[PDB]
Amino acid sequence: VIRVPLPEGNQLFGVVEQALGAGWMDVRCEDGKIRRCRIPGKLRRRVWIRVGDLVIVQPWPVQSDKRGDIVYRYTQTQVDWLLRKGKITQEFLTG
RNA sequence: CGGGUCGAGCCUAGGCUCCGUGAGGGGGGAGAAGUCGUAACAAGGUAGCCGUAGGGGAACCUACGGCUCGAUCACCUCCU
Ligand SMILES: [Mg+2]
Ligand SMILES: [Mg+2]
Ligand SMILES: [Mg+2]
Asked: How far does residue A18's CA lie from ligand 2's centre (Å)?
């Protein structure tokens, strides 16, 4: 079929509202809480993360409130390709 | 029982000091995929810096008197 990072293991999905900066990414997840993410040492070179962008993140189990870690960003090729299959519906990005 | 005298302890009021919490405030140090400019370094595009005073979102701008730890050309002056 295809190779995409689905929710496999303990991943999350991350769509930020506004970046406070300095690494911390502020995401409006549908988990319920306001979450704040940080970046590992491999992806601060080739890519670009902005508000209006959907990515997959990975949390740590602490406090289930403010978690997340960037492990993969989504391209203009797959962001809306993950729509018809309904793995995410876009009613949680503007309303 | 009376007389004198040594006395720790206790109370009240006044002068100083120590310590755990502290509404509100102020700078300091690490973090650098947040923001606004370009002040320094070449004559860094207005030469840079010291003292004192006024001004400005912020680096900073201006006035008077000093220094060279200032670049280029032309003419002098003083030497080797
Ligand atoms: Mg400058
Ligand atoms: Mg200048
Ligand atoms: Mg003098």
From this structure: 38
Residue A70, CB, strand B, below 7 Å: yes
Q: What is the resolution of this structure in A?
A: 3.2
Instruction: Report the SS3 class of residue A82.
Output: helix
| Domain spans in chain A, listed from the N-terminal domain onward | 1-95
Q: Quickly give A19 CA vs B37 C1' distance in Å.
A: 22
**Cβ contact A40 with chain B strand, < 7 A:** no
Nearest nt (C1') from A45 Cα: B33
What length is written for chain A? 95
CA A64 to chain centre: 15
CATH superfamily of A1-95: Nucleic acid-binding proteins (2.40.50.140)
Experimentally determined by: cryo-EM
Q: What are residue A82's phi and psi, to 5 degrees?
A: -80, 20
Token couple for A19 = 């970046």
